[PDB]
């Protein structure tokens, strides 16, 4: 959430660069700056990718277990 | 025609200042388009990979 808000505020400050002094050095920094921010917003959510991976194994196992018991109960009724 | 030239010789320096103005404003227009260009090169090349 911090990096989302930082991306938007640095876009507004880049608009302030384009309003006040377009020939400044800072815009090059600014056109680098939010790039670094965008990298981090990808780099955090890639860190959800192992977790998601591990978590899908967990729910698969739960569904696996449930289906076994369901067939057992189905068969026993028969 | 040389007389027309030496007549315009009083008006030479104002046209020099006008060339300075035009160069400066063209430079700032290239700054705007360069900012938009580098943002596009951020959004379509570096973040996709």
From Swiss-Prot, chain A:
Post-translational modification: Constitutively sumoylated.
Superkingdom assignment: Eukaryota
Subcellular location: Nucleus
Its job: Component of the Mediator complex, a coactivator involved in the regulated transcription of nearly all RNA polymerase II-dependent genes. Mediator functions as a bridge to convey information from gene-specific regulatory proteins to the basal RNA polymerase II transcription machinery. Mediator is recruited to promoters by direct interactions with regulatory proteins and serves as a scaffold for the assembly of a functional preinitiation complex with RNA polymerase II and the general transcription factors.
Subunit: Component of the Mediator complex, which is composed of MED1, MED4, MED6, MED7, MED8, MED9, MED10, MED11, MED12, MED13, MED13L, MED14, MED15, MED16, MED17, MED18, MED19, MED20, MED21, MED22, MED23, MED24, MED25, MED26, MED27, MED29, MED30, MED31, CCNC, CDK8 and CDC2L6/CDK11. The MED12, MED13, CCNC and CDK8 subunits form a distinct module termed the CDK8 module. Mediator containing the CDK8 module is less active than Mediator lacking this module in supporting transcriptional activation.
Family note: Belongs to the Mediator complex subunit 7 family.
Name under which the protein is recorded: Mediator of RNA polymerase II transcription subunit 7
Species annotation: Homo sapiens
Residues of the full protein shown: 79 to 156 of 233
From Swiss-Prot, chain B:
Domain of life: Eukaryota
Tissue: Ubiquitous.
Cysteine disulfide partners in this protein: none
Protein's cellular compartments: Nucleus
Ranges that cross the membrane: none
Family from the record: Belongs to the Mediator complex subunit 14 family.
Subunit structure: Interacts with GATA1. Component of the Mediator complex, which is composed of MED1, MED4, MED6, MED7, MED8, MED9, MED10, MED11, MED12, MED13, MED13L, MED14, MED15, MED16, MED17, MED18, MED19, MED20, MED21, MED22, MED23, MED24, MED25, MED26, MED27, MED29, MED30, MED31, CCNC, CDK8 and CDC2L6/CDK11. The MED12, MED13, CCNC and CDK8 subunits form a distinct module termed the CDK8 module. Mediator containing the CDK8 module is less active than Mediator lacking this module in supporting transcriptional activation.
Function, in words: Component of the Mediator complex, a coactivator involved in the regulated transcription of nearly all RNA polymerase II-dependent genes. Mediator functions as a bridge to convey information from gene-specific regulatory proteins to the basal RNA polymerase II transcription machinery. Mediator is recruited to promoters by direct interactions with regulatory proteins and serves as a scaffold for the assembly of a functional preinitiation complex with RNA polymerase II and the general transcription factors.
Name of the featured protein: Mediator of RNA polymerase II transcription subunit 14
Origin species: Homo sapiens
Shown chain mapped onto the complete sequence: 98 to 146 of 1454
């Amino acid at each position: 959430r911090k990096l989302n808000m930082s991306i938007l505020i640095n876009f507004l400050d880049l608009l302030d660069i384009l309003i006040r002094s377009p020939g400044s050095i800072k815009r090059e920094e600014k056109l680098e700056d939010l790039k670094l921010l965008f990298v981090h917003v990808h780099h955090l959510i890639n860190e959800y990718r192992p977790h998601q991976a591990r978590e899908t194994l967990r729910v698969m196992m739960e569904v696996q277990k449930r289906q076994r018991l369901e067939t057992a109960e189905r068969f026993q009724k028969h | 025609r040389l007389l027309a030239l030496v007549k315009w010789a009083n008006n030479a320096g104002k046209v020099e200042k006008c060339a300075m103005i035009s160069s400066f404003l063209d430079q700032q227009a290239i700054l705007f388009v360069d900012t938009a260009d580098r943002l596009a090169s951020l959004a379509r090349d570096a973040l996709v990979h």
